[PDB]
Amino acid sequence: EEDPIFTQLAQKMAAAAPVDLLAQYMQVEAHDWHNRVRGAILGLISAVPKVGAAISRLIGLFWPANKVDIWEALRAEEYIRNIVQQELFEFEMRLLENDIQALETTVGRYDTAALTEKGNFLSIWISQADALYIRMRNSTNNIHLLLHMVTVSTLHLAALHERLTFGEELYGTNNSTNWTRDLVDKFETYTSDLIPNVFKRWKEWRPTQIEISAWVRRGSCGNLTCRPDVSYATVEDKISGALFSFQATNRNSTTLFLEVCEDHKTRMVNEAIADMASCLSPTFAFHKLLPDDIQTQFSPYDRQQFGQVFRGPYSQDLSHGLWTAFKNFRSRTTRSDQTLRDRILEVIIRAGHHVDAIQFVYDHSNPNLTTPGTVAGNAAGGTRHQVDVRDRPIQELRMEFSQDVLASLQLHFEDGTSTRKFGNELGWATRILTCTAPYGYRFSSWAFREDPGPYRTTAISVLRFQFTPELDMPLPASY
Amino acid sequence: EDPIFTQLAQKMAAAAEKEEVPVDLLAQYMQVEAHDWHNRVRGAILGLISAVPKVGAAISRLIGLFWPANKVDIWEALRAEEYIRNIVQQELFEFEMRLLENDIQALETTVGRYDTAALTEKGNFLSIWISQADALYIRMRNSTNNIHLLLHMVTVSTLHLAALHERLTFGEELYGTNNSTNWTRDLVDKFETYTSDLIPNVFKRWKEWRPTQIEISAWVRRGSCGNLTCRPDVSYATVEDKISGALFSFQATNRNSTTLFLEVCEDHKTRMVNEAIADMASCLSPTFAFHKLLPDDIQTQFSPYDRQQFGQVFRGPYSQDLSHGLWTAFKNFRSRTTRSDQTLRDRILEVIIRAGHHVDAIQFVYDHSNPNLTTPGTVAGNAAGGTRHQVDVRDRPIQELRMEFSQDVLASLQLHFEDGTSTRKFGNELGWATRILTCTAPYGYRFSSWAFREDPGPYRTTAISVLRFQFTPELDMPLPASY
């Protein structure tokens, strides 16, 4: 007995025939919790001017009849395994169970209350949500509860928004100055203090779980041969479990492999920070709960912490698991594009057998003009492809590496459509890597390394992509 | 920088001037190093027959491969074998090797003494080599963790048979007497015990153990009507390999069952076991060349390897469903093949690929008793659909197959050849691949057969949704130039 959704998706792809709607749906499900939190916030802004209407929608998303609840949906978040230790926030949540049930009881009582009793339950809701967040924030394992803090802060500000929006209906008085100040103050505490500061503590911890080991065995002449010196190094992430091993003979050095190991650590930390930033990105929509007339007085998020996140770098060298020889490893970018403009209008790709050139083309203060990015690679080589990405944001970039350089590039758009693969039309890809936008973030910039390629022209050997929060990200239909 | 990387870079630049699709010589070299131990063992065996019969010459060649000046030794080359992490526990054979260190050191002393000795002294040292080599293998065989020393057994059995071959080949000028009858019987007897008893039987014990490291767990949390909602029943299942660390997770709401996900978890376990067996089979494949050490006139009297254990190994199955890590709903999972091609013929002459937007049909064309004729295999998929691509794989064996999956079916196929050249990608010329999977022949094995599952694709035609590839040992596999 199959779940009917898979049947409908198979028929929908037949009807369309095109986009892999099956894969599309499952990628939405991977971010179920994320979509619920965003869905609940968007509901508070868009919903009919009717007391409890938006809150009823929030309850439907967070505590549906036929689906997992918000707390267990949280457990299944795609990125969770790379950023926090499941077992630690499992323990903390056993201590918070009765406080969470109490808050849920109050949320339910507000929903079912007559208008004359709603005001009382909302006050209790506000207090309970406030206390529950303070508990999580004061916990020894607070950094592992960061997604639980996104959930509770959402419930807190939902109630504060409800109280301001419908305050005269709930209480009768005109205390809108107080109701406004209360929303603003708790908005500030979360978005300017508690979320950034706990994220900073988390960011200091995450790299400590990646251990670099370097050692040597001195050569030995005995009966049969003279065995050479062997220098070794390993970089292991205890969270993700990713392991990269290096060794080189006829060398006696504990420093030889530190640079490439540190580059791998930076890369793993980049991936971890981007994942966490994504999971916190729903809190960047709290800004939209503030009255329109004061929205320009507040930042939607802490730009130092969340303004810039990275995936990669990517290279043929960075993909190899176990080295038996010492190479001049292409393990990081050596050139960064402009970052001032954070919206891409076009991507220019020159390509023949390999990728000849990449240029991001950004927006301009004057919306009629554009800001040409740095030209990576050979500006004269191959065929020039101008991909207009106005009205189709980039969701994923696929890179193929061959002969130690970038062989091809392909863009995957938000709606699931894609470009042609540019370069390596006929050839075999040694490595295939997919750079996926952190959910809630857009491509904002990039960095690269250039090297002489096998055609004795400038090739792109290393790529790293930079992202900034997307404050106007559309949700899937069902949300 | 190691001078090899600059050399490889220059060679690819030279080739780029002439060839439309040049070979990744860098990747090619690094894939040879990934199997350094394997290549050394094969190179050592081959060198006994390859060399014009000259006393000590083949043994000198073996010593150069096993204990070089500017590379790691045979024992540490072993540790770095690509497949090792999927098959054996390193800590367990580390523990055993510490107990065997002084015996290995003794055998190595004797090998060096044989190599450096004058002709009149060589004979004595070779006899000591034989005794020490035999004794060391029995210690590994009798070992508590013998299954984890299988690659070490491959190494010692090579050293043991190398010496027995040397004694038969040069026995007259070593010892003076002609005892070729006894020397033949000794080589045959040890060849037999290794290839027909000890390697097959320890492999059987290993094969019994490897599946036990894969755990399947199923449980349910029943629904609860409290204050604010009625929480639904959730059914869970997991399949985890404690060796590779591979983990696949399943859950479905509004279902109360511990049986729902057992079939898909069992199919994952079967797939994980397939990949492990193929990995280990590859590692033991150099012992299949022991046969070539036997005198030409008796080679037809012996099997080069145990066909039941090593005749057929598998990689996959591969499908879009099988690649997904965490499921939040129940699907009719496409997790195993439903139809296997013929297996009687085990040499492929051609692969026919029909493709349009996706792969329409695949057919393997095998050898025939009559070398003028062929044996067309079963046609998988839509025999009429797409553009027909006939790939002649006479003179270019298949090293790797690349599969792209999109819309729950096979979107494209691409062939990677032994020499590093490839075909075009057939299908999905302009599209985005949901999943990309590479099926790499176990090193020492060639593609011998395949199995598949068919499903209706999005274009209302028969599509290929699941692929599994079967392999048989390649007894005439060439070595890289280096070896």
CSV table of C-alpha atoms in Angstrom, one decimal, chain A residues 14-394:
chain,number,residue,atom,x,y,z
A,14,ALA,CA,3.9,12.1,-17.1
A,15,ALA,CA,1.3,15.0,-17.5
A,16,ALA,CA,4.2,17.5,-17.7
A,17,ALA,CA,6.0,15.4,-20.3
A,18,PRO,CA,10.9,18.6,-17.7
A,19,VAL,CA,11.5,18.9,-13.9
A,20,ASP,CA,12.0,15.8,-11.5
A,21,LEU,CA,8.8,16.6,-9.4
A,22,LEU,CA,9.5,13.4,-7.3
A,23,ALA,CA,13.0,14.7,-6.3
A,24,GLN,CA,11.6,18.3,-5.9
A,25,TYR,CA,8.9,17.0,-3.4
A,26,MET,CA,11.4,14.9,-1.3
A,27,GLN,CA,13.9,17.9,-1.1
A,28,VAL,CA,10.9,20.0,0.2
A,29,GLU,CA,10.2,17.2,2.8
A,30,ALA,CA,14.0,17.2,3.8
A,31,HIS,CA,13.3,20.9,5.0
A,32,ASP,CA,9.8,20.1,6.5
A,33,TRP,CA,10.5,21.9,9.9
A,34,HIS,CA,12.2,24.9,8.1
A,35,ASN,CA,9.1,25.3,5.8
A,36,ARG,CA,6.7,25.0,8.8
A,37,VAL,CA,8.5,27.9,10.7
A,38,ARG,CA,8.6,30.1,7.6
A,39,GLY,CA,4.9,29.1,6.8
A,40,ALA,CA,3.8,30.1,10.3
A,41,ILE,CA,5.6,33.6,10.2
A,42,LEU,CA,4.3,34.3,6.6
A,43,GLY,CA,0.8,33.4,7.9
A,44,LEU,CA,1.0,36.1,10.7
A,45,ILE,CA,1.7,38.8,8.0
A,46,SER,CA,-0.7,37.7,5.2
A,47,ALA,CA,-3.7,36.2,7.1
A,48,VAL,CA,-7.3,37.9,7.2
A,49,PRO,CA,-7.7,40.6,9.9
A,50,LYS,CA,-9.5,38.1,12.3
A,51,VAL,CA,-8.2,37.3,15.9
A,52,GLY,CA,-6.7,33.8,16.1
A,53,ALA,CA,-6.9,33.1,12.3
A,54,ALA,CA,-3.1,33.2,11.7
A,55,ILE,CA,-2.5,31.4,15.0
A,56,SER,CA,-4.9,28.6,13.9
A,57,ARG,CA,-2.8,28.2,10.7
A,58,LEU,CA,0.5,28.1,12.8
A,59,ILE,CA,-1.1,25.3,15.0
A,60,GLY,CA,-2.1,23.4,11.8
A,61,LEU,CA,1.6,23.6,10.5
A,62,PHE,CA,3.3,22.9,13.9
A,63,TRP,CA,0.8,20.2,15.2
A,64,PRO,CA,-1.0,18.6,12.1
A,65,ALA,CA,-3.3,15.5,12.4
A,66,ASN,CA,-1.6,13.4,9.6
A,67,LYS,CA,2.1,14.5,9.9
A,68,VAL,CA,5.0,14.5,12.5
A,69,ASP,CA,4.9,17.5,15.0
A,70,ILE,CA,7.3,20.5,14.8
A,71,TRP,CA,9.7,19.0,17.4
A,72,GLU,CA,10.2,15.6,15.5
A,73,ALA,CA,10.1,17.3,12.1
A,74,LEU,CA,13.1,19.3,13.5
A,75,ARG,CA,14.9,16.0,14.1
A,76,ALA,CA,14.7,15.1,10.3
A,77,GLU,CA,16.2,18.5,9.1
A,78,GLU,CA,18.6,17.6,6.2
A,79,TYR,CA,21.6,19.5,7.8
A,80,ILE,CA,21.1,18.5,11.5
A,81,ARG,CA,23.8,15.7,11.4
A,82,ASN,CA,26.6,18.1,10.3
A,83,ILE,CA,25.9,20.9,12.8
A,84,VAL,CA,24.6,19.6,16.3
A,85,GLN,CA,24.8,16.4,18.4
A,86,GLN,CA,21.3,14.7,18.3
A,87,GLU,CA,21.9,12.9,21.6
A,88,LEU,CA,22.7,16.1,23.6
A,89,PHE,CA,19.5,18.1,22.6
A,90,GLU,CA,17.6,14.8,23.0
A,91,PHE,CA,18.7,14.8,26.8
A,92,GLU,CA,17.9,18.6,27.2
A,93,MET,CA,14.4,18.0,25.6
A,94,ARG,CA,13.6,15.2,28.2
A,95,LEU,CA,14.2,18.0,30.9
A,96,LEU,CA,12.0,20.5,29.0
A,97,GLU,CA,9.2,18.0,28.1
A,98,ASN,CA,6.7,19.2,30.8
A,99,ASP,CA,7.4,22.9,30.1
A,100,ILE,CA,6.8,22.3,26.3
A,101,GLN,CA,3.5,20.4,27.0
A,102,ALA,CA,2.4,23.2,29.3
A,103,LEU,CA,3.1,25.9,26.6
A,104,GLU,CA,1.3,23.6,24.0
A,105,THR,CA,-1.7,23.3,26.4
A,106,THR,CA,-1.9,27.2,26.6
A,107,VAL,CA,-1.6,27.6,22.8
A,108,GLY,CA,-4.5,25.1,22.5
A,109,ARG,CA,-6.6,27.0,25.1
A,110,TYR,CA,-6.0,30.4,23.4
A,111,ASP,CA,-7.2,28.8,20.0
A,112,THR,CA,-10.4,27.3,21.6
A,113,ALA,CA,-11.0,30.3,24.0
A,114,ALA,CA,-13.9,32.8,23.5
A,115,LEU,CA,-12.7,36.4,22.7
A,116,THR,CA,-13.4,37.4,26.4
A,117,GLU,CA,-10.8,34.7,27.7
A,118,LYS,CA,-8.2,34.8,24.8
A,119,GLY,CA,-6.3,37.8,26.3
A,120,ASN,CA,-5.6,35.9,29.5
A,121,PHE,CA,-4.2,32.7,27.7
A,122,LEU,CA,-2.0,34.9,25.4
A,123,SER,CA,-0.4,36.6,28.4
A,124,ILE,CA,0.4,33.1,29.9
A,125,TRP,CA,1.6,31.9,26.4
A,126,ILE,CA,4.0,35.0,26.3
A,127,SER,CA,5.4,34.3,29.8
A,128,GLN,CA,5.8,30.4,29.3
A,129,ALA,CA,7.5,30.9,25.8
A,130,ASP,CA,9.8,33.6,27.4
A,131,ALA,CA,10.8,31.2,30.3
A,132,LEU,CA,11.2,28.1,28.1
A,133,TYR,CA,13.7,30.1,25.8
A,134,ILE,CA,15.7,31.4,28.8
A,135,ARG,CA,16.0,27.7,30.0
A,136,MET,CA,17.3,26.6,26.5
A,137,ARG,CA,19.7,29.6,26.4
A,138,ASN,CA,21.1,28.9,29.9
A,139,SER,CA,21.5,25.1,29.3
A,140,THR,CA,25.1,23.6,29.2
A,141,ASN,CA,24.2,22.3,25.7
A,142,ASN,CA,22.5,25.6,24.5
A,143,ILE,CA,24.5,25.5,21.1
A,144,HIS,CA,22.8,22.1,20.3
A,145,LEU,CA,19.3,23.5,20.9
A,146,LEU,CA,19.8,26.4,18.4
A,147,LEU,CA,17.0,25.0,16.1
A,148,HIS,CA,14.7,24.5,19.2
A,149,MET,CA,15.4,28.3,20.0
A,150,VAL,CA,14.2,29.2,16.4
A,151,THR,CA,11.0,27.2,17.2
A,152,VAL,CA,10.3,28.8,20.7
A,153,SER,CA,11.3,32.4,19.6
A,154,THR,CA,8.8,32.0,16.7
A,155,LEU,CA,6.0,30.9,19.2
A,156,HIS,CA,7.0,33.9,21.5
A,157,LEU,CA,7.0,36.6,18.7
A,158,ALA,CA,3.8,35.1,17.2
A,159,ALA,CA,2.0,35.8,20.6
A,160,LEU,CA,3.6,39.3,20.9
A,161,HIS,CA,2.5,40.0,17.2
A,162,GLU,CA,-1.1,38.6,18.0
A,163,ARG,CA,-1.3,40.9,21.1
A,164,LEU,CA,-0.3,44.1,19.2
A,165,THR,CA,-2.3,43.3,16.0
A,166,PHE,CA,-5.6,42.4,18.0
A,167,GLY,CA,-4.8,44.2,21.4
A,168,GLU,CA,-7.9,46.4,21.4
A,169,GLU,CA,-10.2,43.4,20.5
A,170,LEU,CA,-8.5,41.3,23.3
A,171,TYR,CA,-8.2,43.9,26.1
A,172,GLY,CA,-10.4,46.9,25.0
A,173,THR,CA,-7.8,49.5,26.1
A,174,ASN,CA,-5.4,51.4,23.7
A,175,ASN,CA,-2.0,50.2,25.0
A,176,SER,CA,-0.6,49.9,21.5
A,177,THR,CA,2.6,51.9,22.5
A,178,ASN,CA,3.3,49.2,25.2
A,179,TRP,CA,2.3,46.3,22.9
A,180,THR,CA,4.6,47.7,20.1
A,181,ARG,CA,7.5,48.3,22.7
A,182,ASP,CA,7.1,44.6,24.0
A,183,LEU,CA,7.3,43.2,20.4
A,184,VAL,CA,10.3,45.4,19.4
A,185,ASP,CA,12.2,44.6,22.6
A,186,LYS,CA,11.8,40.8,22.3
A,187,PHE,CA,12.5,41.1,18.5
A,188,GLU,CA,15.8,43.0,19.4
A,189,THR,CA,16.8,40.5,22.2
A,190,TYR,CA,16.5,37.5,19.8
A,191,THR,CA,17.8,38.9,16.4
A,192,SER,CA,20.6,41.3,17.9
A,193,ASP,CA,21.6,39.4,21.1
A,194,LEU,CA,20.6,35.8,21.9
A,195,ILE,CA,20.6,34.1,18.4
A,196,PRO,CA,23.9,35.8,17.2
A,197,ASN,CA,25.7,35.2,20.6
A,198,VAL,CA,24.7,31.5,20.9
A,199,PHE,CA,25.6,31.1,17.2
A,200,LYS,CA,29.0,32.6,18.0
A,201,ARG,CA,29.5,30.1,20.9
A,202,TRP,CA,28.4,27.3,18.5
A,203,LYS,CA,30.8,28.6,15.8
A,204,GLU,CA,33.8,28.5,18.3
A,205,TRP,CA,32.8,24.8,19.2
A,206,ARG,CA,32.2,23.3,15.7
A,207,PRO,CA,35.9,23.5,14.5
A,208,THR,CA,37.2,21.9,17.8
A,209,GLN,CA,35.5,18.6,16.6
A,210,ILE,CA,37.8,18.5,13.5
A,211,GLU,CA,41.3,17.1,14.7
A,212,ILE,CA,44.5,17.4,12.5
A,213,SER,CA,47.1,14.7,13.3
A,214,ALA,CA,50.7,14.8,11.8
A,215,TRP,CA,53.5,12.3,12.5
A,216,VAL,CA,56.6,10.6,11.0
A,217,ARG,CA,58.2,7.1,11.1
A,218,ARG,CA,62.1,7.4,10.6
A,219,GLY,CA,63.6,5.1,7.9
A,220,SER,CA,65.4,1.9,9.1
A,221,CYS,CA,68.2,-0.1,7.4
A,222,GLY,CA,68.2,-3.7,8.5
A,223,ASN,CA,68.3,-7.2,6.9
A,224,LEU,CA,67.0,-7.0,3.3
A,225,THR,CA,66.5,-3.2,2.5
A,226,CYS,CA,66.8,0.4,3.7
A,227,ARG,CA,63.2,1.5,4.4
A,228,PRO,CA,62.6,5.3,3.7
A,229,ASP,CA,61.2,8.0,6.1
A,230,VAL,CA,57.4,8.4,5.8
A,231,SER,CA,55.5,11.6,6.8
A,232,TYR,CA,51.8,11.2,7.7
A,233,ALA,CA,48.8,13.6,8.4
A,234,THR,CA,45.0,13.1,8.8
A,235,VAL,CA,42.1,15.6,9.1
A,236,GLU,CA,39.0,14.0,10.7
A,237,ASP,CA,35.6,15.7,11.5
A,238,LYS,CA,34.1,13.8,14.5
A,239,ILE,CA,30.6,15.2,13.6
A,240,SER,CA,30.2,14.4,9.9
A,241,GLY,CA,32.8,11.5,10.1
A,242,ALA,CA,34.6,12.8,6.9
A,243,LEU,CA,38.3,11.6,6.9
A,244,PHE,CA,41.2,12.8,4.6
A,245,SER,CA,44.6,11.0,4.9
A,246,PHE,CA,48.0,12.1,3.5
A,247,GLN,CA,51.5,10.4,3.4
A,248,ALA,CA,54.8,11.0,1.5
A,249,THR,CA,58.0,8.8,1.5
A,250,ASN,CA,61.6,10.1,1.5
A,251,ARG,CA,60.4,13.0,3.7
A,252,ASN,CA,60.6,13.6,7.5
A,253,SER,CA,58.2,16.5,8.3
A,254,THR,CA,55.3,17.0,10.7
A,255,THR,CA,54.4,20.3,9.0
A,256,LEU,CA,54.4,19.2,5.3
A,257,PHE,CA,50.6,18.4,5.3
A,258,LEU,CA,49.3,21.1,7.8
A,259,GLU,CA,48.4,23.7,5.1
A,260,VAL,CA,46.2,21.2,3.1
A,261,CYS,CA,44.7,19.7,6.3
A,262,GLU,CA,43.9,23.3,7.6
A,263,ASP,CA,42.3,24.0,4.2
A,264,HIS,CA,40.1,20.8,4.5
A,265,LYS,CA,39.1,22.0,8.1
A,266,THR,CA,38.2,25.5,6.8
A,267,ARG,CA,36.1,23.8,4.0
A,268,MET,CA,34.3,21.5,6.6
A,269,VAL,CA,33.7,24.5,8.8
A,270,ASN,CA,32.4,26.6,5.8
A,271,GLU,CA,29.9,23.7,5.1
A,272,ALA,CA,28.9,23.5,8.8
A,273,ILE,CA,28.5,27.3,9.2
A,274,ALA,CA,26.4,27.5,6.0
A,275,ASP,CA,24.1,24.6,7.3
A,276,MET,CA,23.6,26.3,10.7
A,277,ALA,CA,23.0,29.8,9.1
A,278,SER,CA,20.3,28.1,6.9
A,279,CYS,CA,18.6,26.5,10.0
A,280,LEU,CA,18.6,30.0,11.8
A,281,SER,CA,17.4,31.9,8.6
A,282,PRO,CA,13.7,31.6,9.5
A,283,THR,CA,14.4,34.1,12.4
A,284,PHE,CA,15.4,36.7,9.6
A,285,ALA,CA,11.7,36.9,8.8
A,286,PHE,CA,10.8,38.1,12.4
A,287,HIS,CA,11.6,41.6,11.0
A,288,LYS,CA,8.4,41.3,8.9
A,289,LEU,CA,6.2,41.1,12.1
A,290,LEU,CA,7.3,44.7,13.0
A,291,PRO,CA,4.8,47.4,12.0
A,292,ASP,CA,5.7,48.7,8.4
A,293,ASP,CA,6.3,52.3,9.8
A,294,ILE,CA,9.2,51.2,12.0
A,295,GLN,CA,10.7,48.3,9.9
A,296,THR,CA,13.4,50.7,8.5
A,297,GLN,CA,14.6,51.4,12.1
A,298,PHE,CA,15.8,47.7,12.5
A,299,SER,CA,18.2,45.2,10.8
A,300,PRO,CA,16.4,41.9,9.8
A,301,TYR,CA,19.6,39.9,10.9
A,302,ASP,CA,23.1,40.3,12.3
A,303,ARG,CA,25.2,40.9,9.1
A,304,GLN,CA,28.6,40.0,10.7
A,305,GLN,CA,27.3,36.5,11.6
A,306,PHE,CA,24.7,35.8,8.8
A,307,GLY,CA,25.5,38.3,6.0
A,308,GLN,CA,28.1,36.0,4.3
A,309,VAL,CA,28.3,32.1,4.4
A,310,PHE,CA,30.3,29.8,2.1
A,311,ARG,CA,30.2,26.3,0.5
A,312,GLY,CA,33.3,24.7,-0.9
A,313,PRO,CA,36.0,25.3,-1.9
A,314,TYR,CA,35.8,22.6,-4.7
A,315,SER,CA,38.7,21.1,-6.7
A,316,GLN,CA,39.9,17.7,-8.1
A,317,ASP,CA,42.5,17.6,-5.3
A,318,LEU,CA,39.9,18.5,-2.5
A,319,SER,CA,37.8,15.4,-3.5
A,320,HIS,CA,40.6,12.7,-3.1
A,321,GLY,CA,40.3,10.7,0.1
A,322,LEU,CA,43.8,9.0,0.6
A,323,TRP,CA,47.1,10.5,-0.8
A,324,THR,CA,50.3,8.3,-1.1
A,325,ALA,CA,52.4,11.2,-2.7
A,326,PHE,CA,52.9,15.0,-2.0
A,327,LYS,CA,51.3,17.4,-4.5
A,328,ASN,CA,51.1,21.2,-4.6
A,329,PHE,CA,47.5,20.8,-3.4
A,330,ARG,CA,44.9,23.2,-5.0
A,331,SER,CA,43.0,23.3,-1.6
A,332,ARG,CA,41.7,27.0,-1.4
A,333,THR,CA,40.7,30.1,-3.5
A,334,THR,CA,43.4,32.8,-4.1
A,335,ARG,CA,41.1,35.5,-5.6
A,336,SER,CA,37.7,36.8,-4.4
A,337,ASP,CA,35.0,38.7,-6.5
A,338,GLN,CA,33.3,42.0,-5.4
A,339,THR,CA,30.8,41.5,-2.5
A,340,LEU,CA,29.3,45.1,-2.4
A,341,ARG,CA,26.4,44.1,-4.8
A,342,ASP,CA,24.7,40.9,-3.5
A,343,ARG,CA,22.2,40.2,-6.4
A,344,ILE,CA,23.3,38.3,-9.6
A,345,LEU,CA,21.5,39.3,-12.8
A,346,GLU,CA,23.5,37.1,-15.3
A,347,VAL,CA,26.3,34.4,-15.3
A,348,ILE,CA,28.7,34.5,-18.3
A,349,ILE,CA,30.4,31.1,-19.0
A,350,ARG,CA,33.0,30.8,-21.9
A,351,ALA,CA,33.5,27.0,-22.6
A,352,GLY,CA,35.2,24.7,-25.1
A,353,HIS,CA,36.4,21.2,-24.0
A,354,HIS,CA,36.8,22.8,-20.5
A,355,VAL,CA,35.4,26.0,-18.8
A,356,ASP,CA,37.4,28.9,-20.3
A,357,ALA,CA,35.9,31.8,-18.2
A,358,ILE,CA,33.3,32.5,-15.5
A,359,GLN,CA,31.9,36.1,-14.8
A,360,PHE,CA,29.1,36.9,-12.3
A,361,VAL,CA,27.1,40.0,-13.5
A,362,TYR,CA,25.5,41.8,-10.4
A,363,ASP,CA,22.8,44.5,-10.1
A,364,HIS,CA,23.6,48.3,-9.8
A,365,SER,CA,22.2,51.3,-7.8
A,366,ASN,CA,20.7,52.3,-11.2
A,367,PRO,CA,18.4,49.3,-12.0
A,368,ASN,CA,18.9,50.0,-15.8
A,369,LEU,CA,22.7,49.2,-15.4
A,370,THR,CA,24.7,46.2,-14.2
A,371,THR,CA,28.0,45.6,-12.2
A,372,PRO,CA,30.3,43.3,-14.1
A,373,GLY,CA,32.2,40.9,-11.7
A,374,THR,CA,35.9,39.8,-11.9
A,375,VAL,CA,36.5,37.7,-15.1
A,376,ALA,CA,38.0,34.3,-13.9
A,377,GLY,CA,40.0,32.4,-16.6
A,378,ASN,CA,40.5,33.0,-20.4
A,379,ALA,CA,38.2,35.9,-21.7
A,380,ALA,CA,39.0,35.0,-25.4
A,381,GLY,CA,38.8,31.2,-25.3
A,382,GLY,CA,35.8,28.9,-26.2
A,383,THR,CA,32.1,30.0,-26.9
A,384,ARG,CA,30.5,32.8,-24.7
A,385,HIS,CA,27.1,31.8,-23.0
A,386,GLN,CA,25.1,34.6,-21.3
A,387,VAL,CA,22.6,33.0,-18.8
A,388,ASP,CA,20.0,35.6,-17.7
A,389,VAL,CA,19.1,34.7,-14.1
A,390,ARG,CA,16.7,37.7,-13.6
A,391,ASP,CA,13.4,36.0,-12.3
A,392,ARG,CA,15.2,32.5,-12.0
A,393,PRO,CA,17.5,32.4,-8.9
A,394,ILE,CA,20.3,29.8,-8.9
